[PDB]
Symmetry: D3
Subunit: 219 residues, 6 copies
């Protein structure tokens, strides 16, 4: 069961400390890049990616919650991103062009779905993704209500992968915590994006927090 900590939930006072810990314990760094337009909020950016890059060996995954993802691919690559996760709802008319550009910069391809977006949205290019993520909360913030209905989407995603012989990892984004770990795994999740409720909140010291989370995942 892979883990991808949501850096918009980290403690900058202990930046170096937390990044190094995460780099030797997690599988991915989940970096939210927002528009203020695609979603009503602003969080991280290429600058941030650039800073994390100084200490990272694990892949930096940039979730592009922006209106014009085309504007950030080259900039993110140069900042050190390893994964560019695209919203299907922002790439109609350019999905293949962007996926090719991402590959040209030697980065992996991620696809992330808003709660109300069906998996078929990606039918013509789902086979080009290394990882597909399911929002289990309407995008934009931390601490939003879990959307049970998304469990079916996770399952459909797993079934689709088997039936088509694909190898993408299935990620979950939004309220991944003790109250949902079980249902999510049963539904088909491979990766957990862990934020405030699943990791950082458990303890002020990240080592302790990680232990608590890991233990809760055990069930």
């Amino acid at each position: 069961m892979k883990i991808s900590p949501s850096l918009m939930c980290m403690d900058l006072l202990k930046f170096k400390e937390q990044i190094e810990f995460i780099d030797s314990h997690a599988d991915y760094f989940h970096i939210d890049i927002m528009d203020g337009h695609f979603v009503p909020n602003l969080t991280l950016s290429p600058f941030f990616v650039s800073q994390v890059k100084k200490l990272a060996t694990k892949p930096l995954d940039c979730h592009l919650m922006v209106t014009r993802p085309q504007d950030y691919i080259a900039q993110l690559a140069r900042a050190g991103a390893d994964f560019i996760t695209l919203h299907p709802e922002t790439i109609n008319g350019q999905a293949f062009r962007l996926i090719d550009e991402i590959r040209r910069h030697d980065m992996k391809v991620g696809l992330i779905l808003n709660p109300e977006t069906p998996v078929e949205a990606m039918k013509y290019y789902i086979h080009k993704a290394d990882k597909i993520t399911v929002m289990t909360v309407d995008p934009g913030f931390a601490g939003q209500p879990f959307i049970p209905e998304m469990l079916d989407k996770l399952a459909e995603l797993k079934a689709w992968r088997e039936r088509e012989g694909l190898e993408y990892e299935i990620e979950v984004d939004g309220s991944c915590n003790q109250a949902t770990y079980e249902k999510l795994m049963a539904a088909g999740a491979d990766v957990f994006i862990v934020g405030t409720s699943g990791l950082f909140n458990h303890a002020e010291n990240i080592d302790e927090a990680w232990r608590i989370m890991t233990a809760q995942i055990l069930a």
Copy 2:
């Protein structure tokens, strides 16, 4: 001569270290909040403001380079901002309403002009500002070419202040470095927003960088 370090230029690895140093040496924290729309880039956000707040006593100044500044006032106040610097080009039809909202949240008012925006743009509300800033570079990034033409704007701003009996501080944003300190002071600047070329670049250790900067300012 007041100093306001541009945090989008800081080193996150030494976050705590640099914020505490800045808090006891500078006058303001310059926090750039971008849209990806008003300017073609993304940098800081309320999340960063919130983090800086944990260690700050000096005022946090949020430069709103966004299409809809109305969307960030309450959120920024809760994060700990003390100054909200508005772009006159984004508030036609709501300048007075926003200035009142900023005051209602007990924050000071800042006004910042793009290179091509004349000072008269603010004529009907210039007297409500605590600080007025002059972009000496087209907004969006660090390391852009200095715009000499802006010296006249600084002077006009000083003349306007005297002639009208106002008390706003005059700030400069963009390429404030050894090559411009003199001209800027002569023109009428009261505050220097110092970024990569004026501060951070001089040395890896911020103490050293600051004394180098302070020394250069002496001339």
Copy 3:
């Protein structure tokens, strides 16, 4: 067979008269709120809702043909709306958040589909709706050509409701008149939004108009 008069078609000269009559004869008040952007026209607003509220006991249903439905929920609740009908095409990325906000204001949830939008668009949240409406005319005005093709959508909506064990009412919007009553009922309609061609036109006096309509519905 429930009736919901389209107030953008009423006679303001006899406002009080018509609202009171409608309140004691119809099941809902259909209030169109337009953007000039989501649809190329402008009709009613919160002001209008507020006025109708003074005399109403039956629920006020606000059809939100606007780009940013998020901007009107609290304001509409305050004006006295009882139903907020959302366009799935304007809530991708916020359907669950908005539905929760509507409930938080003690209002019922409505979902309305443009002619070219398939019912699956609502698959993940269709079960949260009290009423689902089918546009049988491209949105924006009164007196537009009926779209026969929408009969299949009504039927699919009815089948979906049975197969899933849901309880939402099925509403029709656009050219509900003598020429369509039969086909619409056969297709599965539960509510008729009646406008100029179905109600108001039949007679200058609303009592008479209602009589004529009621009689035509009989067949």
Copy 4:
């Protein structure tokens, strides 16, 4: 001293009563048409204009607080508008084209300025206006704080008219009440747009309200 009641502040329950009273006592009908985009609100529309037209002899003045005023000129003319008041901030690139279109439809031309817009904005076409209005409140709602700074704009407008030998009427929009009548007249106002605080609030019966207002104007 001319009067133009703001219909978005009227009582629809007594629609006919109030329109007829206003038509025989006031000089203009002030009809606010909003976008939800140019200003964050929605109020009246062509539909309302059409209804008022049934009883009006005095000119209907449509204040276009919309992003694309071009979309409403023909429609408004058809509904019965006599005056189309344009926002200079929405017509750069089409002021002369629109003014010509308004004239072709035999309607008078109005120009309205947001608080932060200078009069020079209209310098090249100010001479084509029948009436020029000064917002004394940031546009969008009723009951907003009066902006004293606008008194200078009224004066400048009067001076400009004399110096250029023009004949436009000077209108005031926003918080025209007992507390401002005097200053406004001294500044140069010719027309008062009266809303909730200046008219409708004084009494539930409009005759009484008009009396109270008229009396307060006397001083």
Copy 5:
């Protein structure tokens, strides 16, 4: 096997020569009209259509890659267009209205799909089209990578036509050349939009280029 040359690929120096040749050899004139917004580029326009009209007898097909297709229908009819090809992704909320307007101007209806748009997008109005086109490349330019995945879309389109008893022609747009002719025909294509790689490149003289193309199609 019908042919529709992409005029944005022609040689203006031999305008008259090439148009006349095309008019007596091809079946349609493919005229790309771009927004700079719906797709990141600008190519042809009504002006261009108007010029081609002077010499054409074969139908002019205008591919509307624009945000607001509603703005060009009357103008294009006026310029001499015979076919208006709409993008389903730009007509939600107005497909039926626009199709009716196109017919009212005596023009035929075309429907064109972006690579990532499924055929069901047109399910409610597919029967109103004279021709349906499949983009085999993300829209905007010439010389883009062919998208094999689109072969399934062509096939689905053919199957749909048979199963529903429709008569629309199936067109292909994007990299129609020697390397794809076979697969495209096998998939179900009826019309080939030929551009630089399929026609114009083969020879400087268009007669020669056309023979080479025709020969390659033979296989």
Copy 6:
């Protein structure tokens, strides 16, 4: 008195003929590039520029009536443009950046004003322009009503040039014909953008048309 023919008014049937004639008689090629957004129309594009380049020696001047001029500079240079004429109303926040980019591509700088835009809009960068153009008609089309008021703008532009010791050429765009030549020259024009009414209409053969125009200019 320099001449710049508006190519959106030429005859494509005689493309080569007309371009060669223009190249040996005029001073500039005026190429209108529209957005469908900045102005409500579409005309020429980089493709067109590219074609004209094959035969031109005189400078190609690209008038950028687009929302995002930044998107076309490199592409236009590549196509062979020699002049890029920017609208001040589309470059607030990037005027200096774009002017530098234009110079970097070895192209000259043009500045064009909409009728309602004052010359001061360019005050901080007017000295960087090689040519400044005054729209004497609201942008978008050919054959629009001349705007006499623009004569003052031409004069102001001439006075400004003398008073500041600048060397920019003053161009006129919109209805430059027999009825305006005199007034325009008296006002201060150096270059005439000639379109349908001033050139092309006079005769089907361009030699004849040019002769007639030249003669009319004599007065």
